[model samples]
Target: EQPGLCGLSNLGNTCFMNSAIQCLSNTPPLTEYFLNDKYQEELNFDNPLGMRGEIAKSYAELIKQMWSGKFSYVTPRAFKTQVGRFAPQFQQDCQELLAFLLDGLHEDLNRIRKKPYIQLKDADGRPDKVVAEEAWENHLKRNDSIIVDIFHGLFKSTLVCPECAKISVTFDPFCYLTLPLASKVKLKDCIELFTTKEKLGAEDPWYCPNCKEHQQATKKLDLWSLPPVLVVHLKRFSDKLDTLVDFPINDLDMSEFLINPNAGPCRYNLIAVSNHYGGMGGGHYTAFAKNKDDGKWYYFDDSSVSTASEDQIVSKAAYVLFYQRQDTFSGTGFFPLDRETLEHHH
Candidate 1:
């Protein structure tokens, strides 16, 4: 039998260049929206037009499909409906099978019921007999198909962030960065809003109690394949804002930003940062925030907050050049907001 193990690697000493993280820190305030219930009040807005918004919308849809398939094996009704009659029958059948497979989800759930730790082994030189058995049984029944594969089938494929190479695993993958860029501000201006110095003291920041309760109810069990990480990019659409009213806030519809470069794409990267005792059961995500009350931006990490890559940060510098090319905001806008505004916004 294998022995249990525990150790901490280099956690806080990673990258921090992308405005994405900064965007996450400034969200008006963290809002609680369950993976099951995709729509939450946090994302409701009259305008949903930039790449950030589009990515957010896609990310939400991605999670909806991932979580549902993960729990029930079906895409959102709307997504499925759009796939429509011409879609393959095998696809439908596969979805049904996957849904049925996850219906009860005894393996992970039962493991939490028995023990409180995340280690693969228990005391006395033995594997976690119960979870091991369940895993074994699942593989045996499915001829070695793992749970991640099941989800992959439903979503076609997972998205990877080009800048960081880290999979965006939050509700709105690009939310933190893009949201701030929506206005005429350059990326650096928005990024600075989140990086400003504040008195370092213990202030138990307020969180939505209702969201806290929901996190407690739905806990996860494994860490290898943590809740699905979402990724998003800039895009444009004619009637995007009107169509995305029903989606989750973390997701985006980016079409508006692309068409009008003057208005930076509203982007972010939201990952469930923290979770509770169910091993990986609690919901701890990461992303950006723009506090409506204070009118300030912040880079927030749900359970694990860290910096963006240097290259990603350098890319923001490019926005400064982009904006300078055009004189007025009418033709299209750019970033780096003349040194004065840049310093102030940062």
Candidate 2:
């Protein structure tokens, strides 16, 4: 095990949380954000019952302990206990646990206020009737943080009517993309599958609001904006398509899938991968994360940690892949603390 990289002891079947946390902790921007202790001041301490603040504090402490070398392995019992309260599926899928962590962090760091609801009349056109209440977070502004800055991307959905040639395009933000897997799959193939056009007709006809009728339409999805860190989840749990997913460790060009041609280089480099072994009902979770200081890959399986090669990182059991924007390396001044120095401070 490396000095900076520390193992996490699993509490019962807490390997899911361990694997997810390891991958997240290895993320350069996220690690830097938490380690800086900025979240402590930013978190809303007014709400005593809110677990977000406690979760954020626990994560910061865990990150500090990992590098400090005060202990060989640390247990995130407090974090897990809090997560289990809201997310009952904590012991189930590691992927879902990752979402819970991101959501918790985002909710805690949310600084945007809710927008006031606009008064509207009923369908009968009443003079001054309140129809709906709109929350600010839904329409007016977006929440900002290291997680949103790195993982949030815009998804463009297009519905085109074949009769009138009218196209309706809408953009939505997503934290991670779920890609379908094939019998023999590559990362690019899965992306193409997601972007491919699908015809909606016959039983599943699309009603074009513009045309005001049911018509055969083409539905397509594309990337409107790319994030600094791209998280891709392979759809393996449902279909059981346990095919090997081969992905590029570096330089994954997503230019073709971009809605705007001028969107600067949609390229990413793989930094971490979470793998699932065995069947969905009963399986073990492990993670492969690159050390920020050494730029080397390390395999983390609960309390065991070992160095891994590029070839070893590519596996058939890969469930979730984490990629960082190639350009972000220059702008994000990420400097990892030496284990010796961290211990000295301790």
Candidate 3:
């Protein structure tokens, strides 16, 4: 056992950044790429939307230091400075930093240099299978990157006009899932709630081309695809929900939540979690991650690292959850979710 446990130094109120960094570092494929020097060739130095290779360079340096297994703590000053150049004023939200970090990395590692113009046409009586495939290809034309390949998934959105029965469907990209926590429940219920249908009240009407009027509509969103690394953000800060979210540490089945069946591997094992302790106004952030090298859970609190048990993985403090997809393919009979686990939850 090489241990491979490297902590990060906190610069002022940089615990949030440290927490997210720890979570990201635990991601197997990502760290593997950085560790093996696979990112050097793909660094986009001239991408207009990207950080001109700065973010990727900084991240690569940070990941290298972390994976080198040579230090107990790394200052992350360069990485923080690169991030500060874009975000500037310091953000306390770990989710925001994570989102921006991934976005920046995507642009910096994007394979496409010149994107083509793509105009989306209405589904117009076309089968969803055909439309969804076309929509995804169209998206790939403009934004192609390693981040998009791993982190990005599609959301199948459907809107129905009440009067004329005009139905429209669109597939949009999502980096991670934003699940509501009304103070929470079994993690599965939160996912079901996220994909549930809702009615657009008259107060917020949709302009229907067929009805030619602002009318109440039915809207629903479903997961069309699942990412290799699934990021789940528990919406606790918005409503100050102090509820405990019972998330699975292993074998997180997501087949029920997807719009398409047997799309790919849907079983995921928990890799990392960004935790928030204390009340809403003033809370401290920490990270619990399953190290790939040792396959053991480790609690990271900005330069402080301790061993964590699997039983202690799920807690009320879990704010951002990260799961790694597992491949279990047999000849004919294959399922994406664990039906037994879901039934027990129900």
Candidate 4:
């Protein structure tokens, strides 16, 4: 391990949690929010038993401890205990842990925002009303916090009726994108596959509201919006595709798929990646994260930590990848937001 890098002691089969936390902590926008200390004051002490609140506090404390330079490694017993209460699955997937951490952090930090009521439509396009706070908690709000702001992207689903030649477009928000794997593919290829068009026929027919009938249609997915931090998950749960998927370490051009090609730069830099080794049922999780301060890659495996080369970071076992937009903060390197932005949000 490097002098400044710190490791987390894995408790039993807690490598999943550790790897997820390491990758999240290395995220520039997320780490910047936690390190500012102003957000800690927003933690609700009223609900002492709230798992989200407790998890948020634990994460803040863990980051402080990791960067304190007092200890080589620290054990996040409190975080683990709180997570275990909600997610009882033993040796769970690191992706689940990442979701838990992001949800907890969002809940803790968004307490200060005033909850507003907004008009919404139901399944039948009937008008309805909902509180903003409830909608946000249920993942209705696309851009909620620093975490959501960086990770949330919009997907436009277009269904075209072959007979009528009419097209319907619907937009949905996504925190992470799951790309399908080919026999041998790269990250770019997987992305292209996701946005490719498919024919809807046979068992699955498109119900065209305009036509008022079922018809064979062409369905396609396109990027409506891109997030500052693009999280990509390669579908490897089935263990059918075990081939290496190559990806770029820096300057990943996504302008080709953007809603507007001229809307600034659609480039991203790889920051962190989560990898799973062995078979699906009996596998171990590890992560590689780039230190924002030094701009170097580090491999973290449970209680052990070590420096990793650029080549070492790319592997067939890569399960999840975290990419940061190149133009998010401009001159600001690791810590993107300033004190004023933090205070305003707080």
Candidate 5:
């Protein structure tokens, strides 16, 4: 039987925490599969997050175009990091997903490089140099963007695979089906269940999204029966001094807000949700608290989701925040707000 919520951590399916690592590790080696002699320079990036300019933009655009009409996306690297950490057996699945992503990146880079100017400056201030060294560095930075794009693509494609033509009939079409729902479940519930299941000493079970055959789902509760919860009333404002009654919520420490589940056998339980618009801008859109181990705040999920068009409007974006309890809400360790905290915090 599937483990109970309390034993989730041991079970190795802590959803968000375990799910994060799914794409990177099991897939073909980053160097072997994605980066080859021909595209090595262009695919190299410092750190997989892709903060470098030209590289970031290129991959970012690639991701945007790939998921142009989709409701959301997740990069292969991020997906692997988030999911693979737990489901080690599915490493091959992760690898296959990464391969598809790399194929897309290969195509994107070819298209952009073929464009008019050899040198270009992206929004992040990095320039696309023609020189071997500088160009390689720029390429490396952009790799992060590509990584992110790949992650997003892997995520979107996996979640919506049942609906896509390419993977619709493939052997394991809905391989990463847990991801989309993992993103939606409250962080707290996610941890609680995953950890509890782990604690219960349950074996890691893999469910086939395609066949609806549970190498494990039957053991765990139907994902639908889990919970439809979220973090609530998280607010972020530009002018802290603005005259919005009860402006800032009570002083909350960062430690009290964000949970580092990695500290113990407990994996980091995190959830990111985006509705209405794409992620952009520099304002706070949402926030959530982590489980208090001993009557103390643990962590927070402060994610921003903005519209693609409104992305240009730096100072005029509005977002909503929700809270969730780690334990009871999901195998993850967090809580859902019992009441709405949206009425202008004092």
Candidate 6:
């Protein structure tokens, strides 16, 4: 018998590999999918763009071992090799590694083997409510998978002719949001800057049919919906946060940054973050994981995992952040305020 705390082996500069995998491992939904053996039935060996279900299974294999809830440590040699073959760059950045892996995994499990071609209209002279419903229905028809169901969100793109009042509409889907940490100080500001409208100049002009003129116009994108597992790529490649950064550990209300927000609550709790320690060129990757099962925060180790102290800082190195929506409340709720939470785990 063993506790779930486990470690990953770093063969070389494989810290990026380790940090990303750790984040995915702690994801209850994905883990639940693999553990139930459903991945076998959903595997897509036919997709030429994919690694013939090899990537998902390689990850699935190690998760099985690690969740033996019994490993002191585990080495992912084949898993590393498999990733190497597909992405020869070896995934130096933890964010890109996670992106590529998820895309590959989604392809393998994608329900529609051959996605049919469908062209979208501008929803000309249609109600926003009517157009929105139809757009989402069409998207589900072509690509229906748990990956999209959990991580994808919709964006409402609208460009209204300020002069003629003619409006254009198209609903776009997103897998994740990459927020920048430049002169901006806090997380909320960065999130706000993402959706804030900017001047639409010159060649990108929206030629209004009503105005009968190709005039300059302002375009805006709104967060129409949010998903369960929200992946955030922090665009913090500067020394600006060389020392410290601030992000809401819990109660991250996304409503402030969204429009429609749907019938769901737009709140989230940070579950994991992929950090790049050291500096730009030579930084090593690791992550902080909050095991939903234990309700405690723990940092990743190449060979060990331990509970985090208040002193544990999320600085400029916070490359990728993982936030699970608060509505996933089955057994796990919010972070328990016990400093000794991990120690008290049974």
Say which candidate scores most in lDDT. 3
Model 3 per-residue lDDT at 7: 85
State every prediction's TM-score relative to the real structure: 0.17, 0.82, 0.89, 0.81, 0.20, 0.84
> Native-vs-model 1 lDDT?
0.24
Error of 1 at 265 (Å): 16
Best by TM-score: 3
TM for candidate 3 is 0.89
| Model 3, span 55-83: residue lDDT tens | 98899899888888788888999999999
Residue 346 in model 1: lDDT: 62
* Candidate 3, lDDT over the whole model: 0.83
314 in model 1: Cα distance from truth in Å? 11
lDDT of 6: 0.76
RMSD of each: 25.1, 7.2, 6.8, 5.5, 23.1, 5.8
Q: Superpose all Cα atoms of candidate 3 onto the true structure and report the RMSD in Å to 1 decimal.
A: 6.8
Model 6 segments more than 4 A misplaced: 1-3, 159-168, 182-184, 199-219, 238-244, 310-313, 331-346
- CA shift of 322, model 1, Å: 19
Q: Model 1 over residues 1-346: C-alpha lDDT tens digits?
A: 0000101111221111112222221221111122323233323223322122232343345443432323312223332222232122310121122222222211211212222332332212233333334443443343211122111111101122233232212111010121123313433343333323222223332222324311112111111111122222211121121111111233332323232223333333232121111111121222333333333323333222233432222221121100101121111222122233346656
- The residue-level lDDT of candidate 1 at 128 comes to 37
Give the runs in model 1 whose Cα sits over 4 Å from its true position: 1-12, 17-22, 28-289, 297-315, 318-346
Q: Order the numbered candidates by lDDT, best leading.
A: 3, 6, 2, 4, 5, 1
Error of 1 at 291 (Å): 3.1
Going through the candidates in order, what is the number of backbone clashes in each? 85, 2, 0, 0, 93, 0
TM-score of 5: 0.20
Native-to-model Cα distance after best TM-score fit, residue 195 in candidate 4, in Å: 0.5
Clashes of 3: 0
The better-scoring model by lDDT among 2 and 4 is: 2
lDDT string for model 2 (1-346, tens) is 3444788898998888898988888888777767667677678544333454767777777888786757667877877787777666664787788877887777666555342344422222221111111221232254555567668877766788887777765556688898878556789999999888988869888887768999879988877677888889998985356898899998899887876655787778899999988888678989999988889998989888888999888888899999988877633332222233355566
